[PDB]
C-alpha cells in the first residue's frame, strides 16, 4: 500500500495516481502538468469551464477531451490516461476534485503542510513569523517538512484568533468564549 492514505471520497483516483506515478518518478512533474491543464480548462470561457455538469455522451465527451489535449501536449503519459478514466465515467465536474486531492497527497509526501490562521483582521508578518517559529518548535511540524501559514479573514470570528493545521488546534478566539460566557451569565 503506498504511504499516506487518502482512498475514498474520489480520493482513490489520487492514491492510484500517486503510486502509479511514484514508481516512474514524476509526481511533481505530473502535479505541475495537472494544475496547468486544469488552468487552461478554467480560462476556457465557452462552455469548457462554464459547463462542468454532465449532459454529454461518451462520444461528445471524447471530442471535449481531444480539445483539452490540443491545448498543450507533454503532460507525461499517466495523467493523459487519467483524463480517459474520468471521461469514461462521464464526470467533468469531478476533474478539479481530483486535481485538488492529488495536490493534497503530493504536498504531504513532499511534506509541505497547509494550515489556516483565522482572525477577522489581517495580522502582521511579525506575528506570522513568531507563530511559524512556535509551530516549528512543537511536535506539530517535524523536519523535512515545510510550513505555509495562511491567514484568511472570516466574519464568523470577531476578535481573537485560532491556529489550525494537522487537525490540531489552539483556540484563543474571543467570539466563542464570549458566547459560552454569555450563556452562563444568563444563569
Amino acid at each position: 500500500p503506498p504511504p499516506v492514505r487518502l482512498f475514498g471520497v474520489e480520493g482513490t483516483y489520487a492514491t492510484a495516481l500517486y503510486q502509479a506515478a511514484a514508481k516512474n518518478s514524476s509526481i511533481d512533474a505530473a502535479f505541475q502538468s495537472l494544475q496547468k491543464v486544469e488552468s487552461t480548462v478554467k480560462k476556457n470561457p465557452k462552455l469548457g469551464h462554464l459547463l462542468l455538469n454532465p449532459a454529454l455522451s461518451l462520444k461528445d465527451r471524447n471530442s471535449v477531451i481531444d480539445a483539452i489535449v490540443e491545448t498543450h501536449k507533454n503532460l507525461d503519459g499517466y495523467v493523459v490516461n487519467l483524463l480517459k478514466v474520468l471521461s469514461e465515467n462521464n464526470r467533468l465536474g469531478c476533474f478539479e476534485k481530483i486535481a485538488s486531492d492529488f495536490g493534497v497527497l503530493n504536498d504531504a509526501h513532499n511534506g509541505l503542510l497547509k494550515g489556516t490562521v483565522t482572525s477577522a483582521e489581517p495580522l502582521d508578518p511579525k506575528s506570522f513569523k513568531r507563530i511559524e517559529k512556535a509551530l516549528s518548535a512543537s511536535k506539530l511540524v517535524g523536519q523535512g517538512k515545510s510550513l505555509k501559514l495562511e491567514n484568511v479573514v472570516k466574519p464568523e470570528i470577531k476578535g481573537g484568533l485560532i491556529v489550525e493545521l494537522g487537525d490540531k488546534t489552539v483556540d484563543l478566539s474571543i467570539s466563542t468564549k464570549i458566547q459560552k460566557l454569555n450563556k452562563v451569565l444568563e444563569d
Binding site: 482572525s119 507563530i131 512543537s138 476578535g159 481573537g160 489552539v170 484563543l172
Partner: peptide, 16 residues
C-alpha cells in the same frame, strides 16, 4: 486586545 491574544497564543503553542 487581538495583540494580547497573539502573545498568549505565542507562549502556549511554543510549549506544545
Amino acid at each position: 486586545k487581538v495583540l494580547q491574544q497573539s502573545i498568549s497564543e505565542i507562549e502556549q503553542l511554543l510549549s506544545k
